[PDB]
Write a protein that binds this DNA or RNA. Sequence first.
DNA 1: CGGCATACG
DNA 2: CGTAT
DNA 3: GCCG
Length: 326
Amino acid sequence: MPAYACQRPTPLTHHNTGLSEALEILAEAAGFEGSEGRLLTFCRAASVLKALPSPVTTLSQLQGLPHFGEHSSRVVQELLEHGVCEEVERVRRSERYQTMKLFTQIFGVGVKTADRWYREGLRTLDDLREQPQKLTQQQKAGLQHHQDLSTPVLRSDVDALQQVVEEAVGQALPGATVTLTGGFRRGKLQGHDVDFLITHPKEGQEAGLLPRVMCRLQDQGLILYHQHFERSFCIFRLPQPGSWKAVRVDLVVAPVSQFPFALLAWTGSKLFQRELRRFSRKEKGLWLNSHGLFDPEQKTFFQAASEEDIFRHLGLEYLPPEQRNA
DNA sequence: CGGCATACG
DNA sequence: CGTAT
DNA sequence: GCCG
Ligand SMILES: [Cl-]
Ligand SMILES: [Mg+2]
Ligand SMILES: [Mg+2]
Ligand code: NA
Ligand code: NA
């Protein structure tokens, strides 16, 4: 079992679902307390289990797996022995965990804002609605739309949204293209937002594109919220039988020279990309981001024409998006 | 022990 | 500070 | 929390 998640296939569904979910609770709780190192370790340990070819049934099967030390091994041991891990259950029922989860799920609220509100004694969404002068406009939109944004987005929703984005993109810049990214490109059947990447085959033609797209969507009455650039974090009005619902949509523009890097980055998963960037820098001495891959010795950028190019230039076996679900 | 991904709004 | 993979 |  390789030590980096980008060195091994990780499918969307797997054979250790309960064990990985428990470790991911501890990762999330670590993040709520600002412990980024422990969050990473628990996420990595969870991801190792997702990559295994069969269920873990005995503690000895963890021997030699990367990212399993005393703490993660004890969690697994308790789940195998008793079906429950007391630490995990203690986190789950705690007022701190439940409130930080509720608050950080709000669009416009991060861990730092949630933690401050918690320390002020706030606990519920209606607590927040009672003092709206404290909220940013983004937080107001996140709170107004919270119920809809909590409802899973389905594949049929994605197909509808892609058509309306393509229509607006086509008037904004003929020849521009729209690619579905994020979790839906990795094969998810449900999600909580939809991610799109926009480019144009002629380098430079994509400059200034996103304002033109957003204005056209807003004039069609489809935008319930946006920040007004190359990234837009929107709330869309999606038609529903007899009504509609609010959906989070992210629109990203990249020049075609950078498209493979942006596609790779925005397809994720989040942990896959962190691990890939860590692998690039620490094992290969190259600096990876959503714009390119830089050789800091020669001071040169690697031209890529495809995701396959990028995996080759990092010495990694290619993984399709469906196997990047770290 | 240091390190833990890297960006944009 | 928030957002994203 | 775990790795090199
Ligand atoms: Cl980036
Ligand atoms: Mg997404
Ligand atoms: Mg997200
Ligand atoms: Na949030
Ligand atoms: Na998104």
